[PDB]
Scaffold this active site. Sequence first.
Site, PDB file in Angstrom:
ATOM      1  N   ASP A  17       0.518  -0.957   0.256  1.00 42.59           N
ATOM      2  CA  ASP A  17       0.160  -0.372   0.081  1.00 42.59           C
ATOM      3  C   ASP A  17       0.449   1.457  -0.234  1.00 42.59           C
ATOM      4  OD1 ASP A  17      -2.460   1.287  -0.023  1.00 42.59           O
ATOM      5  OD2 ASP A  17      -2.676   1.714   2.068  1.00 42.59           O
ATOM      6  N   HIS A  34       2.454   2.768  -9.534  1.00 42.05           N
ATOM      7  CA  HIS A  34       2.421   1.969  -9.332  1.00 42.05           C
ATOM      8  C   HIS A  34       3.684   0.899 -10.441  1.00 42.05           C
ATOM      9  CE1 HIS A  34      -2.069   3.062  -9.473  1.00 42.05           C
ATOM     10  NE2 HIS A  34      -1.551   2.603  -7.843  1.00 42.05           N
ATOM     11  N   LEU A 124      11.182 -19.857  -2.281  1.00 41.50           N
ATOM     12  CA  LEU A 124      10.136 -19.680  -2.951  1.00 41.50           C
ATOM     13  C   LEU A 124       9.057 -19.556  -3.427  1.00 41.50           C
ATOM     14  CD1 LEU A 124      10.352 -16.704  -0.175  1.00 41.50           C
ATOM     15  CD2 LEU A 124       9.430 -16.258  -2.160  1.00 41.50           C
TER      16      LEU A 124
HETATM   17  C1  LIG Z   1      -4.253  -4.729  -3.605  1.00 43.20           C
HETATM   18  C2  LIG Z   1      -3.876  -3.649  -2.361  1.00 43.20           C
HETATM   19  C3  LIG Z   1      -2.913  -3.677  -1.118  1.00 43.20           C
HETATM   20  C4  LIG Z   1      -5.102  -3.065  -1.197  1.00 43.20           C
HETATM   21  C5  LIG Z   1      -5.714  -3.077   0.053  1.00 43.20           C
HETATM   22  O1  LIG Z   1      -5.103  -0.881  -0.159  1.00 43.20           O
HETATM   23  P1  LIG Z   1      -6.023  -0.085  -0.664  1.00 43.20           P
HETATM   24  O2  LIG Z   1      -5.826   0.874  -0.668  1.00 43.20           O
HETATM   25  O3  LIG Z   1      -7.050  -0.356  -1.421  1.00 43.20           O
HETATM   26  O4  LIG Z   1      -6.108  -0.062   1.388  1.00 43.20           O
HETATM   27  P2  LIG Z   1      -8.239   1.139   1.584  1.00 43.20           P
HETATM   28  O5  LIG Z   1      -6.733   2.038   2.443  1.00 43.20           O
HETATM   29  O6  LIG Z   1      -9.025   2.121   0.563  1.00 43.20           O
HETATM   30  O7  LIG Z   1      -8.536   0.297   2.919  1.00 43.20           O
HETATM   31  C1  LIG Z   2      -4.436  -0.980  -5.095  1.00 39.84           C
HETATM   32  C2  LIG Z   2      -3.205  -1.107  -5.198  1.00 39.84           C
HETATM   33  C3  LIG Z   2      -2.919  -1.912  -6.852  1.00 39.84           C
HETATM   34  C4  LIG Z   2      -2.450  -0.970  -4.425  1.00 39.84           C
HETATM   35  C5  LIG Z   2      -1.927  -0.458  -3.431  1.00 39.84           C
HETATM   36  S1  LIG Z   2      -1.510   1.730  -3.133  1.00 39.84           S
HETATM   37  P1  LIG Z   2      -2.449   3.228  -3.658  1.00 39.84           P
HETATM   38  O1  LIG Z   2      -2.759   2.831  -5.017  1.00 39.84           O
HETATM   39  O2  LIG Z   2      -3.860   2.169  -2.940  1.00 39.84           O
HETATM   40  O3  LIG Z   2      -2.443   4.286  -2.959  1.00 39.84           O
HETATM   41  P2  LIG Z   2      -2.752   4.890  -1.950  1.00 39.84           P
HETATM   42  O4  LIG Z   2      -2.050   4.085  -0.652  1.00 39.84           O
HETATM   43  O5  LIG Z   2      -3.465   6.612  -2.080  1.00 39.84           O
HETATM   44  O6  LIG Z   2      -1.547   6.124  -1.650  1.00 39.84           O
HETATM   45 MG   LIG Z   3      -4.138   2.874  -0.781  1.00 38.41          MG
END
Ligand SMILES: C=C(C)CCOP(=O)(O)OP(=O)(O)O
Ligand SMILES: CC(C)=CCSP(=O)(O)OP(=O)(O)O
Ligand SMILES: [Mg+2]
Lengths: 229, 238
Positions: A17, A34, A124
């Site tokens: 995230d 991304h 892994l």
């Molecule tokens: C693929 C992933 C990492 C989904 C969770 O991250 P999000 O950015 O969507 O989660 P929220 O902060 O909206 O809960």
């Molecule tokens: C949901 C995906 C593809 C990755 C998680 S990182 P994000 O796009 O949600 O970026 P932010 O959390 O908004 O900074």
């Molecule tokens: Mg996010």
Amino acid sequence: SCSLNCLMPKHIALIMDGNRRWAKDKGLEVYEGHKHIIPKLKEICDISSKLGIQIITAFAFSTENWKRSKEEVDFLLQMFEEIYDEFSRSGVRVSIIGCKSDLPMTLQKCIALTEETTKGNKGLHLVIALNYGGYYDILQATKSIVNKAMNGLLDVEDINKNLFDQELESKCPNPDLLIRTGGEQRVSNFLLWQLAYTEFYFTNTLFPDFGEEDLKEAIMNFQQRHRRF
Amino acid sequence: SCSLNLQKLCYELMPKHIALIMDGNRRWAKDKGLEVYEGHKHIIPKLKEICDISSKLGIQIITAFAFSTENWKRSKEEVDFLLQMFEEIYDEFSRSGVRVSIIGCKSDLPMTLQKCIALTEETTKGNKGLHLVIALNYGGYYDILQATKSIVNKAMNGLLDVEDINKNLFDQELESKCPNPDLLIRTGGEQRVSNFLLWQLAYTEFYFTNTLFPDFGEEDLKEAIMNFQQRHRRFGGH
Ligand SMILES: C=C(C)CCOP(=O)(O)OP(=O)(O)O
Ligand SMILES: CC(C)=CCSP(=O)(O)OP(=O)(O)O
Ligand SMILES: [Mg+2]
Ligand SMILES: [Mg+2]
């Protein structure tokens, strides 16, 4: 009629995230963030392989991420085809969990090919959760159990933790440790059933900055927790 | 066959539903140099105090984790102390404006505990105030499995089709129902959920404190709520 009376983490669950905030803070277009996802994940697999970790389950696209813009969703689903390039000639064995039939048929084919070319790797095991959610995983296991009952293969009295576990897409052994980058303290519909006893580690480090020293710190925190509890 | 693309989330400046893991009672009694179970003798009164504080603030539901599936493996003198101490729910709450229900496998408890639970539920079922749910002989695996058994028995009797099995159907069969917890508070230093709610926590905000539960009071609860109020909830979008 109820009755209630699977030092170094073997399986790590990873919520990747914080990629947009990383880019916006650097004056970059969101998509620049991304583009770091697949290469960083490859880098983390190499670090973890050398530490003795055996499984990584990484959250790449949730069932709720379809709410984002068409532009962003289209970019991401196209970008995930690089899984083949990054991993097909690596030492990592790669699987995907999630509902593959919603994805573009070109992505479905790269996935099928990545799984095929890496299936014999003994190192892994990387599980990529792509169009996945904990609700979805529990519901598809339930439908499978219902179909077995309707075909005369099991009785309601046979439904137990072990049976249900064998129908889920992510099975025993469950994650010993969960690492979530990006500052938020929540699981966001990841591996709900599988995280019942997992240790939760949240870091403010954004995913594109998460490196070897940050992983080592999470593992040290994990070992400290086990001396205590 | 699966399809998750086209479209159902049960969440809400003030959390409507707070889940509570009450940890750190025995460590509390040792530091205070009292008997091993004196920390446990504070659970229910502290719980009543928390309901009172929370009701004033505007919180509508509290689900409190009193006894897990894994607590059956504690010493049988500690298990008897607790199950007989839970019988004090009746004195503490049947007076109040608090509505009290118990989730979990009730048929495994002493018949005296079963009647005491039924009597508390019936007496307070009309109360209009905060809803207190006490999870007793409960676990997240248990809740999902009993919901699954009930869905299988309906499909086997022609009352539903496999294509009816979706998040809202499952939601209606679980013992802990929508609306789900906006905030989870865990006292006592551990950072995990230990087979408490599983399905219900998909987008719950987590708050972990080192404070032991008997020390957890009005100022600590307001600290937890202000922390929750600073969080940004995205639910997968933007
Ligand atoms: C693929 C992933 C990492 C989904 C969770 O991250 P999000 O950015 O969507 O989660 P929220 O902060 O909206 O809960
Ligand atoms: C949901 C995906 C593809 C990755 C998680 S990182 P994000 O796009 O949600 O970026 P932010 O959390 O908004 O900074
Ligand atoms: Mg996010
Ligand atoms: Mg404890």
